[PDB]
Amino acid sequence: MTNLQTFELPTEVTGCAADISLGRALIQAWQKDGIFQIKTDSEQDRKTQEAMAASKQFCKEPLTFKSSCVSDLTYSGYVASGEEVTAGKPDFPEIFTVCKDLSVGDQRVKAGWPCHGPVPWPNNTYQKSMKTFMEELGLAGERLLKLTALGFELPINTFTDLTRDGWHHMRVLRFPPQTSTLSRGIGAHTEYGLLVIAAQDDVGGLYIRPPVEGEKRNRNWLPGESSAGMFEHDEPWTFVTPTPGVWTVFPGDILQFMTGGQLLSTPHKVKLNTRERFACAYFHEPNFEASAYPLFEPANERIHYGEHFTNMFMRCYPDRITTQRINKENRLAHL
Ligand SMILES: NC(=[NH2+])NCCC[C@H](N)C(=O)O
Ligand SMILES: O=C(O)CCC(=O)C(=O)O
Ligand SMILES: [Fe+3]
Numbered sequence: 122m123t124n125l126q127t128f129e130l131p132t133e134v135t136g137c138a139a140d141i142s143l144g145r146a147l148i149q150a151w152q153k154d155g156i157f158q159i160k161t162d163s164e165q166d167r168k169t170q171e172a173m174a175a176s177k178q179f180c181k182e183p184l185t186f187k188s189s190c191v192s193d194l195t196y197s198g199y200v201a202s203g204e205e206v207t208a209g210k211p212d213f214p215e216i217f218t219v220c221k222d223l224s225v226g227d228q229r230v231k232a233g234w235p236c237h238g239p240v241p242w243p244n245n246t247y248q249k250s251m252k253t254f255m256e257e258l259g260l261a262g263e264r265l266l267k268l269t270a271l272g273f274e275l276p277i278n279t280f281t282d283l284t285r286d287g288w289h290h291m292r293v294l295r296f297p298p299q300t301s302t303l304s305r306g307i308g309a310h311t312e313y314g315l316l317v318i319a320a321q322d323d324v325g326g327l328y329i330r331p332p333v334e335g336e337k338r339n340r341n342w343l344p345g346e347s348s349a350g351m352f353e354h355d356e357p358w359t360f361v362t363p364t365p366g367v368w369t370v371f372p373g374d375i376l377q378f379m380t381g382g383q384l385l386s387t388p389h390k391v392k393l394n395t396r397e398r399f400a401c402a403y404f405h406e407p408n409f410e411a412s413a414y415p416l417f418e419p420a421n422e423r424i425h426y427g428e429h430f431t432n433m434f435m436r437c438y439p440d441r442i443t444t445q446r447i448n449k450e451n452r453l454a455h456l
Contacts, residue, residue, distance in 0.1 A: 122331065122359045126150045127158040127367060134267035136277050144272030147265070148384070151372060154359070155331035155387040158367040159261065166366055168254045169320045172293065173399050175250040179243055180215060180295045186243070187215070193442040194230065194238025195220055196434045197290075202297060205437050207308035208350030213297060213393065214306060217243075219251050220290040234409075235431045235452035236443075255291055255403065258318050258368075262289070262405030265316055265370060273380070275416065280315060280379075283413065288314070288406040288430060296326060296400070299393035306391030306398075309353040311341050312373040313433050314406035314426070317387075319369045321400040327361040329371060330388040338385055341374045342424050348388060358390070375407060378424055381417045406430070428456060 128147060134140050150157040161169065179187070184201070191198040200216035222240045223230050229237045242248040266280035273279075296306045306326055321327060330352055339346040361369055371387035391400075407413060409427035414420070431453050435444050447453050 129160045130264045141271045144268035148272040156371040172254040175247045176293045190241040192241045193446040197240040212307045214294040217293040258403040283407040283411040288409045291403045294400045296398040304393045306393045309390040311348040311386035314373045314404045315375045316405040318403045323363045324398040325363050326391045326398045328358040375413045379416050
């Protein structure tokens with residue numbers, strides 16, 4: 122809580138002795154702190170700062186242009202400050218969401234799969250910066266998933282077998298400065314996939330909740346057990362202090378389900394600061410068609426990830442044209 126643990130990942134994870142020891146240490150760090158940091162090399166750091174710069178430049182565009190970067194096929198594109206709701210309350214960052222960039226010629230888009238479509242990019246320079254960043258983030262996610270399997274003494278590709286053509290996506294965020302009566306950036310929530318890899322500038326605002334002995338956690342993938350808003354005003358909340366040259370990593374709903382709670386989907390929230398805050402949250406996700414399964418309970422329960430993703434994003438954006446078209450064309454009922 123006072124100081125987060127920081128790890129260096131190897132370029133390749135093969136299953137050697139050092140890989141197993143590192144994977145164990147990563148799991149223990151999650152089980153104690155709910156989060157850890159990983160050191161970035163010069164290339165990872167450059168691509169991070171390049172993405173932040175593109176984010177700041179895009180936010181300087183007029184609102185009428187930013188609001189035009191929307192799609193009714195995919196949730197990729199702009200989200201205005203105040204548009205997204207968490208636990209019914211408006212969240213206040215402006216966001217650009219980057220999901221899998223699929224042309225209208227892609228077979229899944231022609232088949233009308235929910236959430237599948239081309240990103241409404243503001244320009245190609247912004248596109249190149251975000252795609253390059255997400256390639257680098259994906260390499261880290263695969264390393265982390267192999268180390269996580271090794272740390273549980275599972276076959277090395279237990280999780281990466283679910284992430285071939287994974288539904289990886291990213292939220293490019295700018296939080297506005299606070300007012301005297303409003304400091305809620307995003308309410309307490311958990312993410313939906315396997316891993317969250319996050320970067321931030323030096324302003325500060327992210328808080329996470331570590332595992333708490335005796336504290337039962339809602340299973341955000343079940344009806345009536347949303348994690349949105351839970352524990353929001355009760356300690357403990359660890360401040361994720363801005364630290365140069367690191368990314369933060371914590372698990373999502375799928376890891377909690379697959380490990381039977383031995384890993385918890387880390388609740389987190391953002392408070393507005395006295396200055397605007399830029400951050401990027403990347404989500405290393407299963408394939409949209411993947412079905413996650415219990416690893417430690419020899420059980421019929423499954424999570425169809427794509428269904429979880431679509432359910433979650435419709436609850437984030439009930440009035441977005443993407444949500445309207447899913448309802449109008451029964452795209453989720455179809456799924
Ligand atoms: N699309 C997201 N990842 N949103 C993160 C914030 C929480 C989200 N509004 C929810 O209700 O679950
Ligand atoms: O602001 C951050 O660092 C993370 C924001 C976040 O949790 C999210 O967008 O899901
Ligand atoms: Fe989040």
